[PDB]
Design a protein around this ligand. Sequence first.
Ligand SMILES: Cc1cnc2c(cnn2CC(=O)O)c1
Lengths: 39, 153
Amino acid sequence: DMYIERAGDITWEKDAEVTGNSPRLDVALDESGDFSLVE
Amino acid sequence: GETTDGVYRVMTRRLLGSTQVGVGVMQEGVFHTMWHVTKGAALRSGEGRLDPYWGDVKQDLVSYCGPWKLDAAWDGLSEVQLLAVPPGERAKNIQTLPGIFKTKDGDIGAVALDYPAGTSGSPILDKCGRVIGLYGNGVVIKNGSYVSAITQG
Ligand SMILES: Cc1cnc2c(cnn2CC(=O)O)c1
């Protein structure tokens, strides 16, 4: 049986570490909820 | 059980030790997570039990105790924060400018941040602290990096 444990508040953090890029990708979503790359 | 708003870890004791299988959001008395984390199973919170209320494998989302309550959306312009809750590690906010998932049914925001599989269900927030979606369902692109959809109900 699965259980939940509190991990924190949901708040915006001022001056957080900014990382990650912003790619634009063509994707398809199948009936199983799996995303794949369209080529 | 604990019904205070916030971010929570989804744990299991069926495997070796205590393993974190995902994360979710408690808001307005409803627990929100991704379908692939719990597979629609009931959850324990202290001495209480949370029963699934709504779910959909294709959206990859599930809510417990009531209907989906998160309705904020990415505005298409501003930076957002992944409130990442990794297995065995403290909750940490990471800021990013989302990319785009272009589909035949329209566009969806996407966050290019890599975390272990058990971080699935971690909320993505706007500047006002509102949850605009959950992290954890996406794709692995050309050079092995991970890109998650900003999945919202
Ligand atoms: C959050 C997340 C979830 N799944 C991921 C990643 C990266 N690769 N995968 C596939 C998997 O491990 O099954 C990140």
